[PDB]
Amino acid sequence: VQISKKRKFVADGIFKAELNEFLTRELAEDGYSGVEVRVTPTRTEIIILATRTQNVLGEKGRRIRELTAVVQKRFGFPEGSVELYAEKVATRGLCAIAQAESLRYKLLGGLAVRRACYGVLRFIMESGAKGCEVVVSGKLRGQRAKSMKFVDGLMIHSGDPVNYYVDTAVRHVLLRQGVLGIKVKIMLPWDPTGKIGPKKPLPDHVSIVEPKDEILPTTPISEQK
């Protein structure tokens, strides 16, 4: 007795939504940036992308051996079926989450907001992004909240090409007086056949090939190869 496929394709996304939330509250201060699930029939693999790979497994690997045992009890895996691996994000500057969490640990450590935000925009642009926007909202000056917005470069807002040419992250930081919201948007470059950026070009960009210069003949010559 098995399940309907309508319910099966749904239950595979509810499982992946809670695992990401659990790992977010667990490895955020260690550079957590995403998870990937590979359902091999013998062994279910879970890949965790992060910046600080040493703070994920820990000394002697005493931390990822705790995760692989606390995950199977929660989700009813048989023993030994599920294995968790830790890997490194290829480029940290173009991941919105890794920059929306980097800026949170600077506002939580006594940096000025104006200098904390420019230090993030500079690193985003120097890594090869096409544009960036960082917004900070909350009570920064007194009992009245207000928003500071820092932009740099190009930034698209409308259409379908926004679903793959931009990366968005929203995070909360809890200060002594309240909560500040941090929003980070990164617009990626093209990079044809590349790991970063979409391979598809922008739908409005037309690339015209420059012709190869040639000399039109003046007199007729036959080449009898």
């Binding site: 006594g110 940096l111 000025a112 104006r114 200098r115 000056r141």
Partner: peptide, 30 residues
Amino acid sequence: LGTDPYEDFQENWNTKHSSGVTRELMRELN
């Protein structure tokens, strides 16, 4: 890692502390 006089002046140039934020920004510049 202290306070930023630029941000202080930009946010308090029209409040009660304008005369002080101008002085601090001038100290930082010169």
